[PDB]
RNA sequence: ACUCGUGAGAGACUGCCGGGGUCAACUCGGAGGAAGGUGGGGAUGACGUCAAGUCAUCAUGCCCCUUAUGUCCAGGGCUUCACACAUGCUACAAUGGCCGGUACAAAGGGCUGCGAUGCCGUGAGGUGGAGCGAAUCCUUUCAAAGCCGGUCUCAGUUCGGAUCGGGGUCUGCAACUCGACCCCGUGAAGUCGGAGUCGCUAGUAAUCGCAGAUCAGCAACGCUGCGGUGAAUACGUUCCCG
């Protein structure tokens, strides 16, 4: 076990909790319903890159905000997708649940979306070097990105031996606290097993 | 009036000094009912003896936290602070002798994997 | 008659902002307050093992910190009461009225 | 020489053979053996060419001696373990015959790390 | 663990909620005072008649998502493995790493 | 041991078995599975087939063994030496 | 000690006798951190010695120390791949430390029914030149002398 | 002085000397001395014959000690043996009878260690 | 007003002085200061190694079972004991045992939980329920080692508590296998431990108590924390280890 999770390193400094609420007696069931919501939303939506899911709770009314790169996919033009999600979130006993569907400004600067894309490309047929290089170039082309590292491990290329490969461009200071490192991880489903993809992205400091 | 504090490894002493006789009122108890340890009493009185202002100050002291030794150290520091506040031109004597320095020695935190702060479990090579 | 307002949150900044906003509102209504009296921070500590299987000597510690603020007002005019039940605060901080 | 063998699963006759082969090394050790343990383990995966792995540990008067080999069956692993342990014991000897060649000795010759430094006068030779 | 064992607990909970609320406690409230006539009451026998699942003694709190039966934490209702990963992702409010 | 206020513990199955056994004053072998039941003076003549884990061992009650449990007389683990 | 010598602890003078040596003595007889018990033991022993002799106890304690203080000690030295017992001169502080440790230990296995009595008798016989610690110093000096051949390195 | 067939120690305080009777510990000695009036801190040579006889008849009155206690204990263990109970055969083979582990410890019941 | 609690800030930066220094890094000493030279302790673990561990947290390729290797139930087992190894606790006593009086902490926990006063038991404990979602009440007002007084007089003992007999309490549907605790009695080994070997550089080792998690109960002497009292020694890198 080498490196701790970058989000968990700067949780009280740079990054923010993805669930904002307060509970004293009902902490346990709040956590249970939160993880249920998370797994439901991860399962239901896979076409559009679901970058992040936020939950805010206040008595009866519950606020679930999710960030996607393709809002149109997740919303029914007549509300069909919206109706379906609202309905099965009522089924989740969330009482009154209202949803704020949002959009990421620059998909290529978001580590989770980058890992999602690289994993998808890896799954079907693409050689892993091509995927990592394309992702690195796309993210480096973005104005605010200062350093990106992509690493994927497993039976790469359908081989019998597992391998770890990583390419880096610029600065990725994992030991520096004030540097905000966006961390994203996603497992690629191949016919030969499971390939794990991680992405680190450095975008300056926050003070 | 004047009031200082002394802090020695979590022992906090609040003191009140007036120019009365050298009677020691420690939370309603005297220097012998309290602190029945001769080394401890010497530790209390040492700043006075190096400043030679013994038996010319009434002392009211509040004690809370820690054991007798930490309380005694904090009390001595509080007395030194009261003395420098009352008679500034004695500062060289109290400072050279080291009574004006707060002691930054605290209980070291216990660490996981070790029985104590530094003591480690017995490891068998064989 | 005075009503106690108790504040509890995991983020000190949010609870401070809530305290100052509540004070501003009640002074807008024309009341007398005491101020955001700070209260001891509650710390809940948890120690776990990193590895799923063995490797026990490797432990990781977590803590949950709760910050408490105390708001007390006087002269409870009905406008102040109505203003109190017309205040919006972040979902992180809960308000106890007693 | 008493040896305890801690196998696992299926390895019939491995324990007796290993015990009898290892116990013959007691005379080879130049210091009394305080403990002797042997562990036999077989790899589950049939793809492994040498599935059986044998390890040993001897406490040669406080000096830890250990070896580990692989084999295709219990007998071969035990024999390779015996060879490896014998080599380690030979390298561990540390009696006089073992260190007579390493003694710096060589009066004014073969500069070694522990060779006696030359005594030097205060004045230059000239 | 095993979905059979994961689901085996929930029926224990609703059975306890069905029984232990008043039936499995009113008998105990009668055994407490020695002045209460317990001997001819035979409520000890009656409580034995009840199914074992009415007893909270058999209840085994598990991981609310994973079903892991050990390393349970009551505050989160989570296994020790799961809380460590969930805290690192900032999904439990007001939880972070410790230092002192 | 169990508190005295609760009283001796006997399962209802073997309890009603023995009380119908002694209502006509003959004792047959009673096959039981409750090692946790206590020996009560109404068992005095009855011979019990107490479960062991593998089989049931016949246990004939006497006077002295009253107050114990049936498990005292159905040893579980077998050991003959090394 | 690889990077250089370590600072010493300036332990303070005793309040009721005003000498450094008694504080060193209490810290030698100390066990488990029970300082008060050690001080009680040493004060009782000193007062017993004063009663038996009739003079100040500190002077007799110094006399006992000088009677038991060593000057030449033997250490194992490894020169040229061989180990010998080499007699070495002892610095003053190490000599006082050795003397105090010997006094405390040899008083610990006396037979006087109490630590105070054992310590008092040991210090008295050391002042008079009959104690077992004096004998120990005799043996250590004899050992240093018998190995004087190896003093040249 | 001979009490209930047991000689006392030569110089001990009364209650601790009374502990030297097989059926008497520290609590029993204290309570019998309190009941029968003899002081507890008196030495074993200062006793009178009347003190001896009051101890004797009181102990023989409301206590069982020495031979009767030993034989009662032995009878209890033997009866536990002969009913075939678990503790019976546990006593029969000299192993601990109260659930103590026997993988490593329990040399007290096993006696001194034997090597094979 | 003084502590304290928790918000904001200042404060150590070789900043200054003197000397070594290539006038360079750096280094020695002094002053000022609460603190002096990364102040103390944490968190933080590079590329990789050891096919190290984990298909039994989870996920998962392939293979296998599928009237069973799936699943429900009672009982039993995981606690077996001639031994061997490992980590600990308690001791072998007078720097102590026992009895009476008496002083000082921190941290943490508590709603179907903490649970006080009182009363009843010798004691585990029983009845009862004040007040408490708690800087408020309860954990007693909080400790023990400590201090003072008496006693014990060097003994296998007033040391040591194992084992065992009897009698109870509580939790639990249920303490037989297989819980903890209380009372009476019983009173084993053990007289400081071979070869060899371990931890520790200061608020440290040694020693004393308190709390938490898991938890109906507990096998907790375990683990994770908290404070009380508080040493010795470091000449120096030849030897052992990395």
Q: Which residue is nearest to nucleotide I189 (CA to C1')?
A: H108
> Residues near G84 by Cβ (< 8 Å), separated by ≥ 6?
G76, G77, G147, G150
CB contact under 8 A, F6 and E34: no
CB contact under 8 A, H83 and F62: yes
Tell me which residue range forms the domain holding F57: 1-82
> Residues near A75 by Cβ (< 8 Å), separated by ≥ 6?
A81, A82, A101
CA nearest neighbour of F67 among F5, F8, F24: F8
Structural domain count of chain C = 1
Report the alpha-carbon angle E27-E32-E35, nearest 5. 105
Largest interatomic CA distance in chain E: 62
Question: Using CB atoms and an 8 Å cut-off, which of residues 80-119 of chain D contact chain G?
Answer: 99, 102-105, 114-116
Write the CATH number for F71.
3.30.860.10
CA nearest neighbour of E9 among E67, E51, E85: E67
Please state the three-class secondary structure of chain G as a single string: CCCCCCCCCCCCCCCCCCCHHHHHHHHHHCCCCCHHHHHHHHHHHHHHHHHHHCCCHHHHHHHHHHHHCCCEEEEEEECCCCEEEEEEECCHHHHHHHHHHHHHHHHHCCCCCCHHHHHHHHHHHHHHCCCHHHHHHHHHHHHHHHCHHHCCC
Two structure tokens written together for A170: 């610029």
* Pairwise CA distance, residues H68 & H60, whole Å: 11
* Alpha helix ranges (H) inside B38-67: 38-51
Q: Which helix (H) or strand (E) covers residue H51, if one does?
A: helix H49-62
* Pairwise CA distance, residues E65 & H105, whole Å: 42
Q: Which bases of strand I have any atom within 7 Å of the beta carbon of a protein residue?
A: 1-8, 32-35, 39-48, 51, 53-54, 56-62, 70-88, 94-96, 103-109, 111-112, 126-128, 133-135, 143-148, 151-154, 158, 162-166, 168-180, 183-188, 195-207, 213-216, 219, 223-239
* Alpha helix ranges (H) inside chain F: 12-21
CB contact under 8 A, E44 and F5: no
Sign of the alpha-carbon torsion through B64, B66, B69, B75: negative
What's phi and psi for B14, nearest 5 deg? -100, 135
Q: Which residues of C touch A20 (CB under 8 A)?
A: 90-92
Distances in whole angstroms, Cα of residue C11 to Cα of each of A15, A17, D28, E4, E95: 13, 11, 70, 41, 11
Give the gap in angstroms from C-alpha C18 to the nearest C-alpha of chain A: 14
CB A182 within 8 A of CB A111: yes
CB B19 within 8 A of CB B57: yes
Breaks, C-N > 2.5 A, in chain G lie after: none
The DSSP result for A18-64, as a single string, is SEE---SSSHHHHHHHHHHHHHHHHHH--SS-EEEEEEEEETTEEEE
Q: Are strands A19-20 and A50-58 parallel, antiparallel or unpaired?
A: parallel
Question: Using CB atoms and an 8 Å cut-off, which of residues 66-85 of chain B contact chain G?
Answer: none
Q: HSE-up of D25 (CA within 13 Å, CB side)?
A: 29
CA nearest neighbour of C38 among C10, C75, C3, C6: C6
Write the CATH number for C62.
3.30.70.600
Q: Report how many Cβ contacts below 8 Å link chain A to chain E.
A: 60
Chain C residue with minimum CA distance to E100: C61
For E77, left (φ over 0), alpha (ψ -120 to 50), or beta?
Answer: left
What dotted CATH number matches G20-147?
1.10.455.10
Report chain B's terminal Cα–Cα distance, integer Å.
Answer: 69
**With 0-12 CB in 10 A as exposed, 13-18 as middle and 19+ as buried, what is C66?**
middle
**With 0-12 CB in 10 A as exposed, 13-18 as middle and 19+ as buried, what is H40?**
middle
DSSP E56: G
What dotted CATH number matches B1-126?
3.30.230.10
* Pairwise CA distance, residues C25 & C22, whole Å: 5
CB G147 within 8 A of CB G87: yes
DSSP A13: T
* Alpha helix ranges (H) inside chain C: 12-28, 78-84
Q: Report how many Cβ contacts below 8 Å link chain B to chain D.
A: 6
Collapsing DSSP to helix, strand or coil, H9 comes out as coil
Query: Which of the nucleotides lies closest to B123 (Cα–C1')?
Result: I198
Report resolution (Å) to 1 decimal. 2.8
Q: Which residue is nearest to nucleotide I201 (CA to C1')?
A: G6
Q: Which residues of A touch C94 (CB under 8 A)?
A: 22, 24
Distances in whole angstroms, Cα of residue A33 to Cα of each of A45, A76, E85: 18, 25, 17
Report the alpha-carbon angle A67-A70-A72, nearest 5. 110
* Pairwise CA distance, residues C57 & A187, whole Å: 30
Q: Which residue is nearest to nucleotide I1 (CA to C1')?
A: B3
Two structure tokens written together for B120: 């480690």
> Which of A22, A58, A63 minimises the CB distance to C9?
A22
> What technique determined this structure?
cryo-EM
Report the alpha-carbon angle H99-H102-H103, nearest 5. 135
Report the alpha-carbon angle H57-H60-H66, nearest 5. 135
Domains and CATH numbers, chain H: 1-71 (1.10.8.50), 72-116 (4.10.910.10)
- Cβ count near G71 (within 10 Å): 12
As a whole number of Å, the CA-based R_g of chain B is 18
Give the gap in angstroms from C-alpha B121 to the nearest C-alpha of chain D: 19
CB H19 within 8 A of CB H29: yes
Structural domain count of chain F = 1
CB A39 within 8 A of CB A32: no
**Residues of E near A (CB-CB distance < 8 A)?**
64-65, 74-78, 85-94, 96-97
Q: What share of chain H is helix, strand, coil (3-state, %, to 5)?
A: 50, 5, 45
CA nearest neighbour of C9 among C66, C86, C89: C66
Domains and CATH numbers, chain A: 16-105 (3.30.300.20), 106-207 (3.30.1140.32)
Sign of the alpha-carbon torsion through H34, H35, H39, H43: negative
**Test the A interface: residue of E82, E96, E97, E98 with most A CBs within 10 Å:** E96
């Amino acid at each position: 076990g080498q490196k701790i999770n970058p989000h968990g390193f700067r949780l009280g400094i740079t990054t923010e909790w993805k669930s904002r609420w307060y509970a004293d007696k009902q902490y346990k069931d709040y956590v249970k319903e939160d993880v249920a919501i998370r797994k439901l939303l991860a399962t239901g939506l896979e076409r559009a890159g679901i970058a992040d899911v936020e939950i805010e709770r206040t008595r009866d009314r519950v606020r679930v905000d999710i960030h996607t790169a393709r809002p149109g996919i997740v919303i029914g033009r007549r509300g069909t997708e919206a109706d379906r999600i609202r309905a099965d979130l009522e089924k989740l006993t969330g009482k009154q649940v209202q949803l704020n569907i949002l959009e990421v400004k620059n998909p290529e600067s978001q580590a989770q979306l980058v890992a999602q894309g690289v994993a998808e490309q890896l799954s079907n047929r693409v050689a892993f070097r091509r995927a990592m290089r394309k992702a690195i170039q796309s993210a480096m082309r973005q104005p605010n990105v200062k350093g990106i590292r992509v690493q994927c491990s497993g039976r790469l290329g359908g081989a019998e031996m597992s391998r770890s490969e990583f390419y880096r461009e610029g600065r990725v200071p994992l030991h520096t606290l004030r540097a905000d490192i966006d961390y994203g991880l996603y497992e690629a489903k191949t016919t030969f097993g499971r390939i794990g993809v991680k992405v680190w992205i450095y975008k300056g400091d926050i003070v | 009036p004047i009031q200082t504090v002394g802090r020695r490894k979590e022992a906090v002493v609040r003191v009140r000094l007036v120019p009365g006789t050298g009677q020691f009122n420690l939370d309603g108890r005297t220097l012998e009912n309290y602190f029945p340890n001769k080394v401890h009493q010497q530790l209390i009185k040492a700043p006075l003896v190096t400043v030679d202002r013994v038996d010319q100050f009434d002392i009211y002291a509040h004690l809370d936290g820690g054991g007798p030794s930490g309380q005694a150290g904090a009390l001595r520091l509080a007395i030194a602070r009261a003395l420098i506040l009352v008679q500034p031109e004695d500062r060289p004597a109290l400072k050279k002798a080291g009574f004006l320095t707060r002691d930054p020695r605290a209980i070291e935190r216990k660490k996981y994997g070790l029985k104590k702060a530094r003591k480690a479990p017995q490891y068998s090579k064989r | 008659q005075k009503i106690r307002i108790r504040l509890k949150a995991y983020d000190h900044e949010a609870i401070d902002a809530s305290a100052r906003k509540i004070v501003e509102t009640v002074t807008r209504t024309g009341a007398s307050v005491v101020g955001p009296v700070p209260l001891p921070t509650e710390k809940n500590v948890y120690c776990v093992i990193r590895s799923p299987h063995k490797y026990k000597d490797s432990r990781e510690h977590f803590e949950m910190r709760t910050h408490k603020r105390l708001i007390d007002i006087l002269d409870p005019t009905p406008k102040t009461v109505d203003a109190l039940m017309r205040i919006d605060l972040p979902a992180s901080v809960d308000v106890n009225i007693q | 020489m008493d040896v305890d063998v801690s196998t696992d699963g299926e390895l019939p006759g491995a324990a007796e053979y290993a015990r009898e082969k290892i116990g013959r090394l007691s005379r080879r050790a130049h210091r009394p053996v305080l403990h002797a343990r042997v562990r036999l383990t077989r790899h589950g995966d049939p793809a492994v060419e040498r599935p059986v792995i044998a390890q040993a540990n001897l406490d040669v008067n406080g000096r830890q001696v250990r070896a580990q080999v692989e084999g295709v069956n219990a007998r071969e692993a035990v024999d390779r373990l015996e060879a490896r342990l014998r080599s380690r014991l030979e390298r561990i000897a540390e009696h006089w015959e073992a260190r007579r060649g390493g003694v710096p000795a060589e009066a004014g010759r073969e500069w070694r790390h522990e060779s006696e430094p030359a005594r030097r006068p205060g004045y230059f030779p000239r | 663990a095993k979905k059979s064992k994961i689901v085996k607990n929930e029926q224990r909970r609703e059975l306890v909620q069905r029984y232990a609320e008043r039936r499995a406690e009113l008998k105990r409230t009668i055994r407490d005072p020695a002045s209460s006539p317990e001997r001819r009451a035979a409520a000890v026998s009656a409580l034995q008649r009840l199914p074992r699942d009415s007893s909270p003694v058999r209840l085994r709190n598990r991981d609310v998502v994973d079903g892991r039966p050990r390393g349970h934490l009551r505050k989160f209702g989570l296994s020790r493995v799961r809380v460590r990963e969930m805290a690192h992702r900032g999904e439990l409010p007001g939880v972070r790493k410790a230092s002192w | 041991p169990r508190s005295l206020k609760k009283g001796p513990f006997v399962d209802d199955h073997l309890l009603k078995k023995v009380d119908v056994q002694n209502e006509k004053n003959t004792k047959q072998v009673i096959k039981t599975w409750s090692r946790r039941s206590t020996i009560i003076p109404d068992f005095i003549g009855h011979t019990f087939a107490v479960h062991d884990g593998r089989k049931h061992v016949p246990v004939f009650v006497t006077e002295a063994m009253v107050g114990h449990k049936l498990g005292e007389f159905a040893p579980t683990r077998t050991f003959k030496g090394h | 000690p690889r990077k250089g010598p370590a600072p010493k602890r300036p332990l303070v003078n005793d309040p009721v006798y005003g000498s450094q040596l008694v504080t060193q003595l209490v810290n030698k007889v100390l066990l488990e951190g029970k300082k008060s018990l050690a001080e009680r033991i040493v004060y009782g022993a000193l007062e017993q010695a004063r009663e038996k002799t009739g003079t100040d106890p500190v002077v007799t304690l110094k006399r006992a120390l000088d009677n038991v203080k060593p000057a030449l000690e033997v250490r194992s030295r490894r020169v040229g791949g061989a180990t010998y017992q080499v007699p070495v001169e002892v610095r003053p502080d190490r000599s006082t430390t050795l003397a105090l440790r010997w006094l405390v230990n040899f008083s610990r296995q006396r037979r006087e029914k109490t630590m105070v009595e054992r310590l008092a008798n040991e210090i008295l016989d050391a002042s008079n030149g009959l104690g077992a610690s004096v004998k120990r110093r005799e043996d250590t000096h004899k050992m240093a002398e018998a190995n004087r051949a190896f003093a040249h390195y | 002085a001979r009490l209930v067939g047991v000689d006392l120690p030569r110089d001990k305080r009364m209650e601790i000397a009374l502990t030297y009777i097989y059926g008497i510990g520290r609590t029993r000695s204290n309570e019998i001395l309190a009941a029968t009036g003899i002081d507890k801190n008196m030495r074993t040579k200062d006793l009178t014959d009347d003190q001896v006889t009051v101890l004797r008849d009181y102990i023989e009155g409301n206590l069982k000690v020495e031979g009767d206690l030993r034989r009662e204990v032995q009878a209890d263990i033997r009866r536990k043996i002969e009913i075939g109970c678990y503790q019976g055969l546990r006593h029969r083979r000299g192993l601990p009878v109260r659930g103590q582990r026997t993988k490593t410890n329990a040399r007290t019941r096993k006696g001194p260690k034997r090597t094979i």
